[PDB]
Amino acid sequence: MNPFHELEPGPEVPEVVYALIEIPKGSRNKYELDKKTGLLKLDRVLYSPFFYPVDYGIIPQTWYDDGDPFDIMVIMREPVYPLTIIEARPIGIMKMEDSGDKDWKVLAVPVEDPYFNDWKDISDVPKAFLDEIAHFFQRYKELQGKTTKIEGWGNAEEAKREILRAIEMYKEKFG
Amino acid sequence: MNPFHELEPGPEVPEVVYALIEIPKGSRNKYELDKKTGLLKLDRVLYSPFFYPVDYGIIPQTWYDDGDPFDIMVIMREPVYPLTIIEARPIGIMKMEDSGDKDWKVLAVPVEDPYFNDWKDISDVPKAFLDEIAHFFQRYKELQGKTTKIEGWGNAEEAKREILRAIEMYKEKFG
Amino acid sequence: MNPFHELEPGPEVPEVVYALIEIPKGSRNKYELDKKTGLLKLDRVLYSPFFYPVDYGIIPQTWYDDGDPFDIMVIMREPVYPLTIIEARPIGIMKMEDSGDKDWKVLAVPVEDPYFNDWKDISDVPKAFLDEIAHFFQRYKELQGKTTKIEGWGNAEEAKREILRAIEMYKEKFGK
Numbered sequence: 169m170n171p172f173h174e175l176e177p178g179p180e181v182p183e184v185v186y187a188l189i190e191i192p193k194g195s196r197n198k199y200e201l202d203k204k205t206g207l208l209k210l211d212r213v214l215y216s217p218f219f220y221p222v223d224y225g226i227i228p229q230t231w232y233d234d235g236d237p238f239d240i241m242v243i244m245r246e247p248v249y250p251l252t253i254i255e256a257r258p259i260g261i262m263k264m265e266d267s268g269d270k271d272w273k274v275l276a277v278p279v280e281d282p283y284f285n286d287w288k289d290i291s292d293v294p295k296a297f298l299d300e301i302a303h304f305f306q307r308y309k310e311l312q313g314k315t316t317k318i319e320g321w322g323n324a325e326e327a328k329r330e331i332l333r334a335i336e337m338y339k340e341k342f343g
Numbered sequence: 344m345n346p347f348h349e350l351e352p353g354p355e356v357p358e359v360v361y362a363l364i365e366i367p368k369g370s371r372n373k374y375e376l377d378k379k380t381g382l383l384k385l386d387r388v389l390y391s392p393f394f395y396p397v398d399y400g401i402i403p404q405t406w407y408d409d410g411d412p413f414d415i416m417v418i419m420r421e422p423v424y425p426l427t428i429i430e431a432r433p434i435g436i437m438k439m440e441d442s443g444d445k446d447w448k449v450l451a452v453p454v455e456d457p458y459f460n461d462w463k464d465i466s467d468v469p470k471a472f473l474d475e476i477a478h479f480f481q482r483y484k485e486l487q488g489k490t491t492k493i494e495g496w497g498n499a500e501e502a503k504r505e506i507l508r509a510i511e512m513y514k515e516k517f518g
Numbered sequence: 519m520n521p522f523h524e525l526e527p528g529p530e531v532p533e534v535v536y537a538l539i540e541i542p543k544g545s546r547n548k549y550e551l552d553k554k555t556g557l558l559k560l561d562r563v564l565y566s567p568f569f570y571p572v573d574y575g576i577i578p579q580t581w582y583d584d585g586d587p588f589d590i591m592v593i594m595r596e597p598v599y600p601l602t603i604i605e606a607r608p609i610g611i612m613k614m615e616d617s618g619d620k621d622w623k624v625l626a627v628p629v630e631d632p633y634f635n636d637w638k639d640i641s642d643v644p645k646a647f648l649d650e651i652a653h654f655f656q657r658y659k660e661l662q663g664k665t666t667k668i669e670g671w672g673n674a675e676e677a678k679r680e681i682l683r684a685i686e687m688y689k690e691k692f693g694k
């Protein structure tokens with residue numbers, strides 16, 4: 169079965185979404201969901217010795233300006249395996265242009281890890297952690313010759329609006 | 344393809360069963376099989392710094408008193424990845440009540456690891472290892488406020504009888 | 519969805535194939551894709567404290583003399599997870615007889631790791647690394663009492679010809 173096409177975007181959209189993880193925190197391999205088969209695929213190995221600072225994946229049944237599902241970053245203490253579904257609370261959004269495409273990314277925490285119970289907005293995240301995520305996306309494709317721009321961070325309300333936008337984009341793209 | 348519904352309980356029931364592993368030994372993340380989609384889901388992160396002492400999963404095409412497939416614990420030297428099928432020999436059964444529900448769990452060894460060839464019954468397991476498993480289930484929900492009660496251990500025959508019961512409970516629930 | 523039957527052998531066969539990895543480098547557990555159900559299965563735990571020296575898997579929609587899809591070994595710096603697709607460039611082939619069956623294995627590198635951009639043929643691989651792979655296959659079944667023979671290595675052209683053979687064997691076996 170196809171997790172991208174057959175799983176709803178979330179159980180309580182947009183307050184709680186499903187994050188389908190592709191890349192566990194700590195990986196240098198850039199795994200992606202193969203949208204046609206539903207299997208994991210190695211898109212590439214990052215060209216620099218950088219690792220994903222968050223569990224990285226997609227919101228099911230979303231689409232975005234770069235021709236892929238909406239990107240979601242989940243803060244997990246123990247990383248999950250690829251293709252794991254996490255119930256995630258959006259708390260903010262990273263504003264990124266990637267190679268000329270809008271490619272903003274939801275920042276979210278797991279609903280079912282009580283460690284994060286008081287993380288509800290972008291102001292709850294350590295500043296250095298936001299900077300480390302932004303810096304990763306600012307530099308990780310430098311050796312690929314691709315231009316990226318990190319514009320800053322939006323709050324949970326802006327993230328939730330963008331989730332609704334991406335959900336609608338999927339419905340327009342796939343009928 | 345849903346392995347819970349579409350895979351038989353075992354190749355030589357109840358002497359050899361299939362264990363579909365959800366949680367590798369050493370995990371604090373409580374992964375589960377999503378019984379509808381067949382994907383792995385993060386049910387929760389354990390509230391305490393405890394780790395699963397066994398590879399933990401389900402027997403396909405079983406059902407149990409707590410509204411879930413029959414739980415199986417497989418002793419693996421190297422943990423397997425989530426959603427791996429193991430041919431497993433039941434050697435005993437942990438007698439547990441969980442939140443008022445019977446929730447006994449098969450203890451089994453992999454047929455195809457020769458290290459365990461002489462493990463055939465509950466008396467073959469080091470006492471401290473049985474105690475460590477029981478203690479995990481005695482305390483792992485304490486910060487969730489959910490009562491568990493470990494009554495003791497049954498032998499391989501009692502485990503095999505319970506497997507047959509759980510197989511019949513699935514046919515009744517889903518037949 | 520059965521990856522063995524429903525994934526194509528590659529995007530540019532035989533220059534680039536898909537490797538569907540079953541066993542990450544470093545594993546002692548011998549994971550296998552079940553050919554009928556598409557689920558990952560533990561076939562066995564290796565009887566000796568050896569680990570797979572390569573990411574190990576199959577080329578989809580192939581068939582081979584041992585009654586199984588064609589085995590492929592991918593050199594990955596960071597191992598992948600079981601059931602991951604890798605776009606792989608064949609660079610050589612290990613000539614192995616296993617329990618009386620021809621069971622040669624493609625050696626390949628990931629197209630999308632620039633570390634391997636200049637690895638194009640068997641002469642690009644450190645000799646000690648080829649020896650370590652051959653030695654693994656020479657001894658990993660010794661405690662199972664199963665005879666293997668490692669005859670040597672073939673080059674990228676021979677590997678590609680054998681991939682084409684295995685693709686045609688699949689079509690013949692499965693009526694495609």
Ligand SMILES: [Ca+2]
Pocket residue numbers: 225226236237238239
């Ligand atoms: Ca993406």
Ligand SMILES: [Ca+2]
Pocket residue numbers: 234266271
């Ligand atoms: Ca991007």
Ligand SMILES: [Ca+2]
Pocket residue numbers: 232234236237238239271
């Ligand atoms: Ca993107």
Ligand SMILES: [Ca+2]
Pocket residue numbers: 400401411412413414
């Ligand atoms: Ca269970």
Ligand SMILES: [Ca+2]
Pocket residue numbers: 409441446
């Ligand atoms: Ca329970």
Ligand SMILES: [Ca+2]
Pocket residue numbers: 407409411412413414446
């Ligand atoms: Ca249970």
Ligand SMILES: [Ca+2]
Pocket residue numbers: 575576586587588589
């Ligand atoms: Ca094989």
Ligand SMILES: [Ca+2]
Pocket residue numbers: 584616621
């Ligand atoms: Ca073989």
Ligand SMILES: [Ca+2]
Pocket residue numbers: 584586587589621
């Ligand atoms: Ca083979």
Ligand code: NA
Pocket residue numbers: 561
């Ligand atoms: Na085999």
